[model samples]
Target: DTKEQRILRYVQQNAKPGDPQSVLEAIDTYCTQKEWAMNVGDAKGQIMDAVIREYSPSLVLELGAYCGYSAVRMARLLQPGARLLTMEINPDCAAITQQMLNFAGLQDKVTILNGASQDLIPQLKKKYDVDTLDMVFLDHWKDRYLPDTLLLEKCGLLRKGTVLLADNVIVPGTPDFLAYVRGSSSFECTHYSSYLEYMKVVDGLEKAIYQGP
Candidate 1:
């Protein structure tokens, strides 16, 4: 069975409807005990939570929605009226994400767009009427991280102090992405060493604060 369907089934059965925290726990518990998936998991998730709390971002963008794990996690912490836009290229995964968000009662806080990040980034301003992003969580394909980020820059979607948190930067790492962010004067970069989701493998997230034109 597809992990998306399996995850959705588990969540619907285990998590309490309308309770975001329960949805978080349910995903973590299943991935930890039964199957392994690419969720942000519990450990790094708290790091993500801290970043959300520290920035208190009003509008956030997430590049992937694997099982809607991070989407539900971030949407629950968003302030009133704050919204999150997450992209999932696969229609099945996108459908599962929407269903999972529904389970958590957070469907209203997030909008799932079914398309490649490359195709959608350029349309954000026109189609979505996006102002500027406060935070961007890059958890899609590791190799695409750099190009999509540059696309964000090209679209003028990022502002000064915009926070970009990228996952799997250490395991199945993105050397080019890390290097670009670290090499630039426009971004103040920091490394948060953490574990790969549901594994003892070496993995970490990179945080970059934008300060450029």
Candidate 2:
């Protein structure tokens, strides 16, 4: 079993079922005490939480759903009727995420999609009927960040005032994404410097507000 699977087992065994906070705490403790997996950790997660609280997004999109840690974290803060749709490319990870979300009792607030963001963004408009995304969280591969953002723009999923929060901007780095958002007049971007997940090494998150085309 993968580390993610092990973490799931730990949560199932230790975390209180139907308690999202307990599940999140269990994941953090497990990652800290045992093997470390990328689930946005706890530090950057606070920043994410703050954004979610402020935005209170009705329709949220998450580009990565690794272990569903961030999904659980964000979903707990979502207002009533708000939905978070997260995409995970790996089938195993996607399944694990679904299980984890279920453990947290967040299955209703989140939709786990197993596919590449490139293919799914367009379908979100036609199939999911997502007219405009209120917020987007980018935590997948650094390389795909810019392309996916462009795809969202092209699909008319992003509208004025849409907030985009991207993780690992400095450590693994997403220079292209940072450059594009910072340079584009359509976005107002800011960087929140912090540590990487489960490490003290410098990393950061980019908070970009869509200013519209």
Cα lDDT computed for each candidate against the true fold: 0.94, 0.93
Query: What does candidate 1's lDDT look like per residue over 1-213, in tens digits?
Result: 887799899999998999999999999999989899999988899899999999999999999997899999999999999999999999999999999999999998999999999999999999999989999999999999999989999999999999999999988899999999999999999999889988888789999999998
Model 2 per-residue lDDT tens digits across residues 1-213: 879899999999999999999998999999999998988989999888888888789989999998999999999999888999999999999999999999999999999999999999999988998899999999999999999999999999999999999999997999999999999989999999889988879999999999987
- Residue 28, model 2: Cα distance from true site in angstroms: 0.9
Candidate 1 regions with alpha-carbon error over 4 angstroms? none
Among these predictions, the greatest lDDT belongs to: 1
Q: What lDDT is obtained when candidate 2 is compared to the true structure? A: 0.93
lDDT of 1 at 182: 98
- Residue 28's lDDT within candidate 1 is 92
TM-score of each: 0.99, 0.98
